[model samples]
Target: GHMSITENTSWNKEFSAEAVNGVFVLCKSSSKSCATNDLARASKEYLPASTFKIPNAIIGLETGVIKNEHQVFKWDGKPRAMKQWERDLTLRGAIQVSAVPVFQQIAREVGEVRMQKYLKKFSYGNQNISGGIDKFWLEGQLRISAVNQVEFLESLYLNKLSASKENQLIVKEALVTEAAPEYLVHSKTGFSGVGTESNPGVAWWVGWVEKETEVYFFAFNMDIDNESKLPLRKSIPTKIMESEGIIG
Candidate 1:
């Protein structure tokens, strides 16, 4: 490792969260003690992979498009091609498995235009005011700052994003998973890039942890140029969580 743990040690350098798999963060949503390199920049913005589904679930549930978490649907395995699956899948399963096709279908069913409309109203990201690169999702892409993510999580908790209870239910359920202390943790993980190069696109994990009376949202995104065939469990966050007693 070229970088040292000590700060201002000549070896210390500024790096993108999406690039470094060594981001150590503790998102204590209630106390709001999230340690990071840069707040303004850390919260700046980046792509929202499956994490976007947190809000989309609300949209689908309210529209009655989704019957339940277990509602079954089929899938075509390929990214751009159509090769339907032998068995159907549930909305919950689609998400748990990170089925891109299922979500792509949901996105289409929601309509690009309408989804764009919601994306705007929801304030999914920074919402480019100059309107340079991000006019809408279909037009281009979406970037969400860490600050905006906290706000978005709050919105979902307060029911400010959607007007339907059922929708919110699904959304909440999808965003979090039941955990210890009679609470739930909701989140999403994604790895994106094309062609096998030394460096891939980005690696991400964003979600919330809950304890009966309090809920905390954690969003982590990193990029690694050195596409060394290493497992994620060996990354920085793993040791971080272990050090912080968040996990074994």
Candidate 2:
């Protein structure tokens, strides 16, 4: 049987409180939880997963250096590559396939200091860090709240952030749809379960789902005290996406 899920549009406001305050479950969105969290300062915390890619990709596309989404990179199919996907992936494919090294390369291309500049311009995390936290611990560490996540996503869709005509073309190409009706879903997912220091159990999925008439962007950040204590193995995003249809 298809388990039903509830979709709570205001979830971002709800779940954020759980982390800063206490955990709670409003309802399910399909088989997934449609919980929102209260907005937080973007500076206090850092998300080391795909959540960072949203801004990274935006910066790359806006800079005019990234020529095309189909632009390919050199890669050899090796375990040491640090990336699980095959070598020679395109920016479009890199995003869909969630290529880490490719994104890292984009980061390096964007450069650490410059990336920091952009994050600050975007007001990422409001530029704060927890006390006693070492500065070295901050690199590749981005802080953002669930509310800000959607807000930035909305900015990306409106092209209020950055990009050139060609870059937009590249980005649009990456937003292709094979299953849905070519809905423009410009987004990415992140999994940095082992790098959050306290727990190897922080996973994130963030993206925008769009149609001509309506556009929706969301971020899902799941943290557990320990990786082993994570929930049942399942494609939660797909289940959540499917549940959107049911709950809607």
Candidate 3:
């Protein structure tokens, strides 16, 4: 059986009162079951935003574009939107700061052909890399649904993807957000920054939590009216996970 909405609406109201619209999907790995607020939106596809980094990153490692987690991509000495991006960063650090420039460089190096091959192998999103090699996920045609995100994340969590287990582990290590003796969270955040007065930009916080041996995967996508609301991207899902006892 699937989940019941009676227990999920409270979180949905929390979003509605805040003028936010989006979907949240949480899947338990042990039982291989999932629960969501809007099943329709859960399957709806939108540009992956920075979430593309998940696959883009593994592609980098598998293609040898990124030699290892420790490889430092020297900062280009160019002024960036964020000052932290101005410094040299390893794959881990680049992901931590969501440095667009570093990953853009990685995209160019991966090139279109290899990137396409890997995305197809991973069955990522729409598998459409129509935009430029570097900006496709940001400005081009790559789209993925919340449901798709959890499926992909589940595969990564279990090391079931086409990429080598070591490479999957390498990329997974890069997404670690919270860690403690009892629980650990490996997640990534993505913002498309493509918003308008009528259409809100998409924001994402997708990942999995490991509580002892229990594994749960979750994906959150929100219509961000303002950048200030970005924190809700994580907090909303966190509250939901807390209510569901997926996290303590």
Candidate 4:
């Protein structure tokens, strides 16, 4: 309701070539153009998967549940079998590797009451944490749309949320995925394997780009037949951003 739109055609051909089913929404605060592949679906919400980590990190930091970026979580010693997730990790390491257990601990510590409070303050999609604290955004009910993601991310990028500036800055810095001479890409990816049989595994890559004079917020999410195609979550948006001249 507060943002505008932009026209773009490159995404259609790009996604078509790969036969990927998804939506990409990119917007510039200075312009009315918020490019989209499917506006209707973009407005529709789905489980946030691990992309919930972005806001989870924000709330964890703000609530003192997570004392700081270096706050460590000792691994539960369960055989997750993912090499990177096996060891102990700090908030930064957990965010970098998408360690579910670490975040689950954070959510559990924040608990339901405080967690729901921050979610409301952030105006997160649906403001629903009814899905249970540990599994809510993963297999439970928490959901968000591409457009809603942009709005939430815009607040993080602009330091407009209720969280302290330091907490916001740390979360933003943890999201860094790429950097170059002219632009730095700060992003997070989410994966939820084929929920409820009727839904395909949803993958998400959402964040913003920082340049000399322009900052673009983008969300690219898709449904995949298998986990093997998860890379497309990031690769597809990489193409869209480059085609738009937002990156080199």
Give the per-residue lDDT digits (tens) of candidate 3, residues 1-248.
13322225556876876778989888777325777778788889988888888898899999999988889989768799998888998898888889898889899999989999998888788999888989999989899988888888888988999989999999989999999998999999999885988977899999999998788888999987687888988888888898878776
lDDT of 4 by residue, 164-220 (tens): 999999998889988888778898989988555666878999999988878999998
Show the lowest summed lDDT stretch of 10 residues, model 1. Answer: 3-12
Compute the lDDT for candidate 4. 0.85
What is the lDDT of every predicted structure here? 0.54, 0.50, 0.86, 0.85
Model 1: per-residue Cα lDDT over 1-248, one tens digit each: 01111112111122332234333334564324555544444555665655666666666665556666667776444453323333466777666666656666666676655666666878779543222212222223566765566667766766667457566666676655546656566666654532246634555666666665655555556654544622451344444545545555
Worst 10 residues of 2 by lDDT: 22-31
Candidate scoring better on TM-score of 2 and 3: 3
RMSD of each: 6.8, 8.1, 2.4, 1.7
Off by over 4 Å in 2: 1-44, 76-83, 126-139, 165-169, 175-179, 182-184, 195-200, 225-248
- Candidate 4 error regions (>4 Å): 7-10, 30-32
A best-first ranking of the candidates according to their lDDT comes to: 3, 4, 1, 2
Backbone clash tally for model 3? Answer: 0
Score candidate 3 by TM-score against the native: 0.94
Q: Candidate 2 residues 135-215, lDDT tens each?
A: 211243445654455555555556555445455455655755333654555555555554556544455555566655555
